[PDB]
Amino acid sequence: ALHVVIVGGGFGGIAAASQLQALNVPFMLVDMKDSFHHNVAALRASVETGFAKKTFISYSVTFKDNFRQGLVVGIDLKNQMVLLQGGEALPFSHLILATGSTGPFPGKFNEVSSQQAAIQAYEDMVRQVQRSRFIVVVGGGSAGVEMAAEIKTEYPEKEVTLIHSQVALADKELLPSVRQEVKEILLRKGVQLLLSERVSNLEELPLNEYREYIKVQTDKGTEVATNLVILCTGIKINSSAYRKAFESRLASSGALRVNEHLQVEGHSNVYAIGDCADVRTPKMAYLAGLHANIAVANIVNSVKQRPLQAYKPGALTFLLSMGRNDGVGQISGFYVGRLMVRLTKSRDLFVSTSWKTMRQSPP
Ligand SMILES: Cc1cc2c(nc3c(=O)[nH]c(=O)nc-3n2C[C@H](O)[C@H](O)[C@H](O)COP(=O)(O)OP(=O)(O)OC[C@H]2O[C@@H](n3cnc4c(N)ncnc43)[C@H](O)[C@@H]2O)c(O)c1C
Ligand SMILES: NC(=O)c1ccc[n+]([C@@H]2O[C@H](COP(=O)([O-])OP(=O)(O)OC[C@H]3O[C@@H](n4cnc5c(N)ncnc54)[C@H](OP(=O)(O)O)[C@@H]3O)[C@@H](O)[C@H]2O)c1
Ligand SMILES: COc1ccc(N2CCN(Cc3cn4c(-c5ccc(Br)cc5)nnc4s3)CC2)cc1
């Protein structure tokens, strides 16, 4: 009578599934892929040979018969069933939606393929970077800011140009001191910055591939010759699993509206966690884990008739690695410097925590 189905095996998804498995609660983890992607380290995996294999963790090794690789094509609310591509249909007592977001490669990887192929896709990316003396990164958000730093740190000899449509880099919710230091760190590293300029000829450019000559154009008339184009232009909420069933309760972004208990609006046994939840905080893997703690607890609490926890977001903690040897950010809304970020994030990129959570050892 009690059985939880988790749609999405990302940071929030594996956190919910790791908890219920340790509690021996009957659950089912569903992901279209066979491996969890530690995408927080995906940019480093685009620049360091042999590193990508540490960013994919097989679901079945951890969850065994409690994991199901499948594409969720819909959710049957009346019969309380999750509908899979291929006909499989999973009954649930409670449902956690952890579908996350999609984005341009290499920052995100949301294709159904073999772990070997996924790893190879990043190794190919590394070879493209290594071949390119001139590299352009499009999008000066928190992602492309790290992408530019990673390349210039691993390959100081390369000419790296970051093109950003705004006057300042990284998220607007960050302290001005943090955003200014991100700019300064990139400048001290030798990165060329093109601020307040939007790349205007994107749809004609070859992506993630070395070329002898690529002509990059901006809306201000600037033209940048390059060997390689990398996109860090933003993400989109992945609503493919629930868009039809929860149409009326979606935010403008495709995320699901929720109360403080992270229950999806108009429901008591359906929860949304991570990027696909319409919380006002920045889309963070770290926050997806906190959402998962509240979700699994409130399922157990709703069953045990006990009180329900709530999501009260404190001051923003946000760390920007600036290559493996530098960094800047904030903790509870206060500036923190290189020594802090370098040991907390830049060095390992939280890779070891996912492997520890998944009860596996990286290859
Ligand atoms: C793009 C980017 C993001 C970063 C980065 N760095 C950090 C960081 O350092 N710290 C942090 O907290 N967040 C960071 N983030 C944000 C972080 O990546 C996201 O907030 C985090 O991935 C949110 O995780 P979720 O659990 O909410 O969702 P995921 O995208 O991780 O996974 C979703 C899963 O659902 C699955 N799924 C979706 N729809 C499905 C369907 N219909 N059927 C089956 N499976 C589906 C997908 O296969 C996927 O495995 C970064 O360097 C880059 C380049
Ligand atoms: N925890 C972390 O350290 C961390 C690290 C990375 C990402 N994240 C999170 O993950 C999410 C995704 O971040 P993201 O940086 O990938 O995307 P993002 O935050 O949306 O930033 C992408 C930026 O690229 C710009 N852009 C888009 N198209 C462009 C073009 N053709 N030319 C020039 N600039 C262009 C956008 O500006 P316009 O909007 O003006 O087009 C936007 O500011 C964010 O919410 C972020 O909070 C967190
Ligand atoms: C010496 O005094 C102190 C020392 C340390 C602190 N802490 C440090 C960590 N944060 C939490 C954060 C987690 N994350 C992630 C992330 C992404 C994926 C995975 Br899997 C795991 C984590 N990305 N960014 C952040 S912040 C809270 C404050 C405060 C005071």
Side-chain angles (χ1 to χ4, degrees):
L2 193 68
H3 180 255
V4 194
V5 171
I6 305 171
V7 177
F11 288 90
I14 71 187
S18 224
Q19 286 192 196
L20 303 152
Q21 179 166 261
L23 290 189
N24 269 319
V25 158
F27 76 96
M28 259 305 253
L29 182 65
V30 176
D31 199 82
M32 72 179 60
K33 312 176 287 155
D34 76 3
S35 275
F36 153 81
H37 186 213
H38 192 88
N39 58 27
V40 170
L43 308 195
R44 169 98 29 101
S46 301
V47 71
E48 182 188 317
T49 311
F51 182 83
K53 71 169 165 283
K54 320 222 191 248
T55 74
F56 291 100
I57 306 170
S58 148
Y59 291 119
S60 55
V61 171
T62 290
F63 302 108
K64 309 150 208 102
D65 267 358
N66 280 0
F67 160 74
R68 190 63 116 255
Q69 166 167 22
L71 171 57
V72 178
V73 298
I75 289 139
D76 187 8
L77 291 187
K78 282 302 225 63
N79 308 315
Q80 303 266 75
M81 311 265 305
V82 171
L83 312 196
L84 289 287
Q85 175 158 92
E88 299 188 48
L90 297 172
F92 65 83
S93 52
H94 305 77
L95 175 71
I96 293 165
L97 296 177
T99 60
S101 53
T102 64
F105 189 85
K108 303 263 199 233
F109 187 82
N110 297 292
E111 296 299 310
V112 176
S113 87
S114 70
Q115 179 181 296
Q116 189 182 264
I119 289 163
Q120 186 52 66
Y122 280 93
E123 289 297 338
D124 290 350
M125 188 67 185
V126 176
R127 305 209 263 132
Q128 297 316 304
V129 173
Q130 288 166 143
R131 185 81 199 271
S132 294
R133 300 178 145 71
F134 292 88
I135 300 169
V136 159
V137 177
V138 189
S142 292
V145 130
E146 283 212 18
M147 181 77 261
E150 290 281 341
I151 297 163
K152 196 66 178 183
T153 300
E154 301 301 301
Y155 309 104
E157 70 272 6
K158 287 175 191 304
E159 260 302 301
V160 177
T161 295
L162 174 68
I163 307 182
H164 189 35
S165 70
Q166 301 300 351
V167 72
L169 308 161
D171 299 38
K172 54 191 181 33
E173 296 99 334
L174 294 164
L175 298 161
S177 55
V178 173
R179 304 181 73 196
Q180 180 60 38
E181 275 319 297
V182 165
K183 176 177 189 177
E184 299 286 12
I185 290 165
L186 289 176
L187 290 173
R188 292 195 270 269
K189 268 178 170 50
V191 169
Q192 301 309 123
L193 297 181
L194 261 187
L195 301 189
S196 289
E197 293 205 45
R198 171 166 316 264
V199 171
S200 48
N201 66 340
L202 267 188
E203 75 182 338
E204 78 184 31
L205 302 164
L207 304 181
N208 304 314
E209 194 160 44
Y210 167 83
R211 284 283 187 280
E212 212 74 38
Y213 178 77
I214 298 162
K215 194 153 176 44
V216 176
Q217 275 172 358
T218 78
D219 63 348
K220 305 319 167 82
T222 316
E223 281 171 341
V224 180
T226 199
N227 301 115
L228 175 68
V229 171
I230 299 173
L231 275 38
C232 302
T233 45
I235 65 165
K236 149 74 138 34
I237 308 302
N238 193 336
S239 57
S240 61
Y242 58 81
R243 214 225 190 241
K244 183 47 136 183
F246 296 83
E247 200 168 49
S248 51
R249 289 142 207 299
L250 306 184
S252 84
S253 61
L256 298 137
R257 298 162 57 74
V258 291
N259 61 2
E260 319 104 38
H261 308 313
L262 309 175
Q263 304 181 316
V264 171
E265 169 189 291
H267 296 73
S268 96
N269 69 324
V270 178
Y271 294 80
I273 62 166
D275 286 9
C276 86
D278 184 36
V279 293
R280 303 286 127 76
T281 45
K283 308 302 181 167
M284 306 182 69
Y286 154 66
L287 295 179
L290 300 182
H291 303 161
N293 301 353
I294 293 181
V296 165
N298 286 10
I299 299 168
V300 163
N301 279 352
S302 47
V303 167
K304 290 187 164 229
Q305 319 198 355
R306 255 169 191 180
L308 296 214
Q309 332 191 334
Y311 177 55
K312 301 181 201 293
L316 174 69
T317 286
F318 197 105
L319 309 178
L320 300 102
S321 161
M322 283 287 107
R324 79 177 66 244
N325 289 332
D326 211 351
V328 72
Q330 52 184 79
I331 298 199
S332 288
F334 195 84
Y335 179 100
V336 295
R338 162 189 304 162
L339 299 201
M340 184 66 213
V341 179
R342 187 170 73 190
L343 289 212
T344 301
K345 175 173 175 198
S346 309
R347 179 201 74 240
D348 190 59
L349 290 171
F350 305 105
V351 160
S352 78
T353 127
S354 294
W355 288 97
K356 191 182 290 176
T357 283
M358 292 289 285
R359 290 184 81 170
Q360 311 192 31
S361 203

